[PDB]
Write a protein that binds this ligand. Structure first.
Ligand code: HEM
Ligand code: HEM
Ligand SMILES: CNCCc1cc(C#N)cc(OCc2ccc3c(C)cc(N)nc3c2)c1
Ligand SMILES: CNCCc1cc(C#N)cc(OCc2ccc3c(C)cc(N)nc3c2)c1
Ligand SMILES: C[C@H](O)[C@H](O)[C@H]1CNc2nc(N)[nH]c(=O)c2N1
Ligand SMILES: C[C@H](O)[C@H](O)[C@H]1CNc2nc(N)[nH]c(=O)c2N1
Ligand SMILES: [Zn+2]
Lengths: 408, 415
């Protein structure tokens, strides 16, 4: 069936055909919707999946059923038959990575999807190799503040006992320390990871914003610690354009958001190590990272310096402080010429991106729960935009944390 | 389908277990290959006898289970009595006790409502003896006066006769009992509430003489027994309003904004045991954001962000200054302050979302679940600093329920 989606602000109606191509389940059924749930090979499995991907690749370059296409099918078939897997061509790898981003239903930044620098690291064999590759990624992506989207792809999974993994959840994150008095210093999101680094030999500064070491696992071996050279770690001290006292809060963040714990799937092949990076939407830092109760939780401190009456919730003192923090963050990044996008501009771009995809591609899978910003929702255009969510491959998937799997 | 489904709160780590979804009745619109969770809405004929029996039995069973008389003599007798009614008259009538139970539970089952901790405290007004629009007007006026209660608002529903053949429907044509007019101007601009321009035009055609102001309370347009609808003015003394002022910004009053105290939705259909109540206005009290974010700041509504921001002397040329966000917060601060000052019941979005979490938890424990639509439950501003943002929810449709129905002017056969 052709499915329609309406924008209730502009009354624009798009028609979705693309969803007809998905073959992977979403978690919902006819009788129960799980749209707010965060997470609901063999030779015989592998070839149909490879064939599907090869087919859409040669279809994408307008040479479906070509001599080259047919040969590739045969090439891939023989290679699965004789090795229980196959290797992607470089062109395929790049096409696959861009489309995993394209298909990422939860990403509001996908207007950029085809500007992705793809680093092929499939010849890597050791944690030291991974560290070199990651350093180059970071240096290239940071670009002195003029951030550039990139992904580095390490060797595919083989038998499951020789996985490459980046144990860090992002390449750059701050440590979190569980205090004697039961509280938390630094980032409470990373307390467990920090403890593993400590246990593995990392000597913690025990400050509020200590950059974590890289913890890297190659070919299924024990992971090894590495310090990212500090000149590669671009950071922004947070200040406020009106409140002189804001800089006295001591807040800072890092410029490069680079998620490193997801799994890239292309044509049935699994890439368990594929750190990918872009640039920040301000709310990621200013709302979630700084103001989640289970994160840096700074609302009370800021509201106090703002001298706001904090006794009753209906004074909306949290909401006032939230906006000012997010102002400061955008101002700080912009003053230091570090790429950042505000949630108005970002969501705006995403609506334009949806219109592009519906025209040229017949749809765009999108997850309203994640696309709508964590503040000021309904004064952004995506709030009023009906979206259809469905799962297309290639894709980025969640995977279990390595310390639950690995035996040393 | 699995017997136990789990939901997690990502802030508190609390994990709840849902068994109530097993009692789900109609489809959600999703399939296993697509999710329609952000779609707003995923023939003139009525239920046949065969369609009607199992729906009635289902409801009667559920009623007697609730009062701990399942399998009792009374239960079996009521079953038999209902069965005979349907067989000889192709429909049946609810007992008052059943009617009150069904109405309370349609609210309890309303996945999009954040206010459901209050569900058992609902004043049900039985208007199934109503025969004319004048009578509907009498019932609606009494409802408004009772629910308003001089500002100490009390939740209530008034239930007009159920549907019979579908050519004799009772309808309130208004979408809410109390709403403001909108008037499209020859030059393309709108006066009043742009959301209501269509309904307003209908009223004007029906004879209404419009004041043509910014906040003119609309007349009731009331359809009894399938007849042409009739106009009635609500006695202005029955319409509680709050002028919007600001605890710090003295100039805020000069904006001349006000809103009405009583949110009373009147265009939904109540379904109980396969019976359809097409006219069933229900009312509660407001969450601030319903007025301060949506009513006032939606672009296709009153759209006041700009004018407020200018009076705040904000720099408005760069979106990254968050002038919209800054203005939005102050507007919502004003609304809560004005209502509280005038002692009209209102709830802020922090308090409401916290109550709903406690409510949900209690429902999971005492009922085996609580259907919730995250896309509607999370407030239109400051989402993640409310506890519902981090709460996984399962959405599914239980009966009795409130349902959408077609706009009456689109279907009505004019006499
Ligand atoms: C270029 C600028 C980008 C911006 C502004 C952006 C923005 C965002 C935001 C705000 C989220 C929600 C994050 C959260 O709340 O945790 C997100 C999710 C996501 N992004 Fe993007 N993103 C960008 C680039 C990219 C790139 C380059 C990739 C991959 C090559 C990517 C893949 C993803 C994926 C897979 C998710 C969802 C992960 C999940 O399911 O948990 N994004 N993005
Ligand atoms: C008592 C105080 C109440 C509060 C604070 C409250 C709050 C809300 C809010 C904020 C919404 C979202 C509205 C929107 O964005 O359009 C909503 C929706 C809804 N409420 Fe409640 N509500 C209350 C009482 C009631 C009552 C008494 C009923 C019925 C007996 C009810 C039934 C519903 C239904 C059916 C919806 C969703 C309508 C739809 O699907 O479009 N509510 N409520
Ligand atoms: C409490 N937060 C946990 C939610 C989360 C989990 C995982 C994983 N695995 C991955 C996630 O990725 C979000 C993401 C991914 C990529 C991003 C890029 C490339 C840029 C950007 N600005 N934000 C991103 C944000 C998020
Ligand atoms: C502008 N978009 C309108 C979306 C909407 C449509 C319908 C219908 N039909 C009914 C709706 O009801 C929302 C609602 C219903 C009852 C409420 C009560 C009883 C109290 C309250 N504070 N808000 C309500 C809000 C909303
Ligand atoms: C497209 C989207 O489903 C639509 O804008 C919804 C989103 N969530 C909402 N949530 C509430 N409470 N009220 C609404 O009117 C809407 N509108
Ligand atoms: C329970 C709920 O699904 C969860 O809190 C989600 C809601 N929406 C989100 N949206 C974004 N962008 N990021 C998130 O981490 C979340 N968390
Ligand atoms: Zn769904």
């Amino acid at each position: 069936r052709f499915l329609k989606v309406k924008n209730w602000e502009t009354e624009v109606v798009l028609t979705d055909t693309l969803h007809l191509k998905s073959t992977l389940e979403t978690g919902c059924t006819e009788y129960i919707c799980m749209g707010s749930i965060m997470h609901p090979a063999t030779k015989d499995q592998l070839f149909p999946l490879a064939k599907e991907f090869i087919d859409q690749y040669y279809s994408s370059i307008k040479r479906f059923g070509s001599k080259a296409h047919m040969e590739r099918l045969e090439e891939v078939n023989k290679e699965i038959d004789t090795t229980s897997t196959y290797q992607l061509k470089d062109t395929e790898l790049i096409y696959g990575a861009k489309h995993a981003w394209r298909n990422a239903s939860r990403c509001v930044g996908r207007i950029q999807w085809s500007k992705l620098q793809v680093f092929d690291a499939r010849d890597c064999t050791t944690a030291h190799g991974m560290f070199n590759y990651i350093c180059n990624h970071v240096k290239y992506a940071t670009n002195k503040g003029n951030l550039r989207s990139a992904i580095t792809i390490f060797p595919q999974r083989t038998d499951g006992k020789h996985d490459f993994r980046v144990w860090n959840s992002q390449l750059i994150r701050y440590a979190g320390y569980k205090q004697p008095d039961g509280s938390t210093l630094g980032d409470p999101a990373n307390v467990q990871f920090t403890e593993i680094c400590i246990q593995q030999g990392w000597k913690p500064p025990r400050g509020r914003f200590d950059v974590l070491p890289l913890l890297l696992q190659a070919n299924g071996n024990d992971p090894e610690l590495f310090q990212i050279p500090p000149e590669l770690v671009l950071e922004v001290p947070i200040r406020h354009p009106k409140f002189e006292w804001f800089k006295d809060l001591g807040l800072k963040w890092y410029g490069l958001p680079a998620v490193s714990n997801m799994l890239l799937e292309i044509g049935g092949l699994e890439f368990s190590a594929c750190p990918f990076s872009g640039w920040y939407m301000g709310t990621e830092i200013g709302v979630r990272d700084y103001c989640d109760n289970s994160r840096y939780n700074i609302l009370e401190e800021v509201a106090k310096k703002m001298n706001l009456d904090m006794r009753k919730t209906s004074s909306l003192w949290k909401d006032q402080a939230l906006v000012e923090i997010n102002i400061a963050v955008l101002y700080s990044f912009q003053s230091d010429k570090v790429t950042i996008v505000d949630h108005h501009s970002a969501t705006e771009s995403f609506i334009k991106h949806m219109e592009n995809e519906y025209r040229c591609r017949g749809g765009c899978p999108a997850d309203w729960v994640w696309i709508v910003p964590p503040m000021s929702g309904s004064i952004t255009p995506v709030f009023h935009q009906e979206m259809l969510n469905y799962r297309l491959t290639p894709s980025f998937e969640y995977q279990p944390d390595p310390w639950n799997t690995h035996v040393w």
